[PDB]
Symmetry: D2
Subunit: 213 residues, 4 copies
Amino acid sequence: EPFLIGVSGGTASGKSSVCAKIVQLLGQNEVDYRQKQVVILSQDSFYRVLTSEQKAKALKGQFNFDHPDAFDNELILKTLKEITEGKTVQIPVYDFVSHSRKEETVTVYPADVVLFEGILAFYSQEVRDLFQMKLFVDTDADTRLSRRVLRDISERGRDLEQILSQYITFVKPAFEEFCLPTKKYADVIIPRGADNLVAINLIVQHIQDILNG
Amino acid sequence: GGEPFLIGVSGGTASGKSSVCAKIVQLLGQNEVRQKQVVILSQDSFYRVLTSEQKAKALKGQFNFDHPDAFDNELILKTLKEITEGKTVQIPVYDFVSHSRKEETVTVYPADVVLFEGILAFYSQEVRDLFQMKLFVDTDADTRLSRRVLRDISERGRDLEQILSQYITFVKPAFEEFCLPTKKYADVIIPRGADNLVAINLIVQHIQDILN
Amino acid sequence: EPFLIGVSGGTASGKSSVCAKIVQLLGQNEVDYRQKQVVILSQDSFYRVLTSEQKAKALKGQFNFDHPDAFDNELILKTLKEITEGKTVQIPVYDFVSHSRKEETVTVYPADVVLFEGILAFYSQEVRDLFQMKLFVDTDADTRLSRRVLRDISERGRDLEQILSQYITFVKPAFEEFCLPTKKYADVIIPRGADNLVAINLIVQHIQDILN
Amino acid sequence: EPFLIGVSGGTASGKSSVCAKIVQLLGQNEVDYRQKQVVILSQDSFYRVLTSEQKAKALKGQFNFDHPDAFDNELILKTLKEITEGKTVQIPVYDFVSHSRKEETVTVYPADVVLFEGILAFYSQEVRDLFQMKLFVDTDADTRLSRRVLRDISERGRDLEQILSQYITFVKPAFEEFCLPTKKYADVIIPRGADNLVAINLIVQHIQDILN
Ligand SMILES: O=C(CSc1nc2c(cnn2-c2ccc(F)cc2)c(=O)[nH]1)Nc1ccc(Br)cc1
Ligand SMILES: O=C(CSc1nc2c(cnn2-c2ccc(F)cc2)c(=O)[nH]1)Nc1ccc(Br)cc1
């Protein structure tokens, strides 16, 4: 049975780079995709195929993609279950023009350890109860917001007003209502994110031992 | 201005604390006045005159204007004591170009209500014991950072990376160490800032009652 | 139209005693029952009449009376709407033996000012939209727990193990899940409770100005 | 050189039970004192010898043993730098009558891993910089007071009003002003405490890895 690590934290907490760094340090980027012992899954792969009335809100730009409802809880639960039972799985690739899933999927061969990472990884009891270990990457919201702003201006061509409109109207309230109340389910809290080498090495070491048990 | 009623106002940068003070005095028409019964004092007037070592620091972005050390606590305590005793006082006018006070001082005559506003208004016990009412304008750090970034870009012409580098290195550590722990000393907390018209009307109504 | 003030806070915040002290400082204990210009309603008077399955849970000490499910929001809504229409209204008296309402109701005549006070006074949009002013009495959970333990040994006949088991299992999670998030709806936050005479005198003076 | 783990968190966070459990799961409770590879040091062992002035405050129940000033940072620093140099060390044992150190000491032979555990283990930069790993046991203040009351009420036998007056007056203010600001120096935060078996087993394993 594969070892499931759930990782949560708000946007730009560093939950993504933490998963990236752990997997890099375990030599997994030098390993072919068919033979990887440690795989990373993101909750944002499992965005819902939107209905007519949902797609209408999304064109008007008034659909909160950080709300639990924007996420396909039942496909997440189904898929993680299959992973647990040792089965290989298909991860969707999301089209934001059509708010539907493309035909091309991503294949995920049975792994020894699976990192499942997202803003609402711990929101559903049934999904929480599949994780052997729960990690929350705790970064102050002001810190996270500065990171969000530099990232979205630099590697995307997004405008500063639009970024802070979306943050204040949608991201912040959804973080406070749905994500932050899930911090209390975490086994281990990792402050600051990917620059926290002591916490990362501690989780790398732990996965390393698992790969040799 | 027999025995002024001193109101202390704190809260982080971009909390709303200046606008709240400004709206309170506006809604009282004590705006456009010569017999001002309500005046606003700002802790921003009481910056220390800098050494040339410190002036040199300020030219680079590396002098912490959010630290207690950057404000003249002795002159603030003295100025507020004289106000409490019903005396006319001189407020400095600070020139940032020279990092020193001009000859021009602003004359504040005994008012019936004095609103003293600053990030560190409640930091010193001697100063905080002169306030008969202490207000804290409580606004979330991410909200406050959003307002600060937009003001610094759009009014003040700042570089984005410099704003946020300075935020992380100096402003945030200074707010968490020195300002945020003073919130417990507040009698009343005003969430959000200048848009809190219910909070603001409660403070204008209360100021009119003691003007009578 | 009566002026409606909603008042929330965790258990042992001091919301009850803040209300009680505001009324008494107004002189409204020396005013006659039918002539009360300012009255206090408690969300407590409006516990639901429990189902059979809820009765069962309650008798085994497994029903959370701090959950929104415990409160009769429809009756709360109805009674506040009628008070805004200037009606005389009847308030239920709850009985914890039967988990139901006594025949005895309590009569409240039209007041100028109504204080409504409860852990979940701001939980429901339609109820919170009836308040002209929302006060949240903000007292640290460790402080409030200190008060609860001393209150429950003296008043009730309870031991530490029962008070703390109940607090950890029921009061705390319900407070964090349901009460704490409503704080963002307050217009004014009152730290500490009824020893905050500056905050209390402020609400008193505001209420006096309504009565004039 | 030996591996120094610093552990902090508020009174009754569980940091002491976390250290006990880690050592119990590594089989060190069986190993002979002279051959122990993992040892727990407590900051509580390094209380300062009080001056007459402080001894005077302490007799009147006014010396705050949770204030940084109550810890002998110089002795802590010396003792940990010695452990780091491979040297055998004596740990004081304290008398809370004379507010000074007994005849008897406790000998600690060079260990491969030291857990240094206390409320202010990260307060001093010099102490904090010795630790290759910093753990902070984060337990809610209302939860910690719960445990503290039950623990203290017997283990010492003392009165309930005294435990709670002491907590509100001394412990809570000292935790909020001095301990809580040290959380940002933790590499890893362990929630709830000794019942967190995932977090405990993660640390046990890391230490086993180090001993092999
Ligand atoms: O001041 C701080 C940073 S804690 C903090 N609180 C925030 C931020 C943004 N919004 N809020 C906030 C939101 C809703 C509220 F209702 C209250 C605050 C933020 O960046 N940091 N110190 C701190 C750091 C870690 C811990 Br754990 C606790 C306090
Ligand atoms: O006590 C407080 C704020 S109010 C508060 N919140 C608490 C306490 C204990 N647990 N929580 C809590 C835990 C999880 C939640 F989701 C919500 C609440 C507490 O004593 N006070 N902090 C404080 C006060 C003064 C200073 Br100075 C610094 C920090």
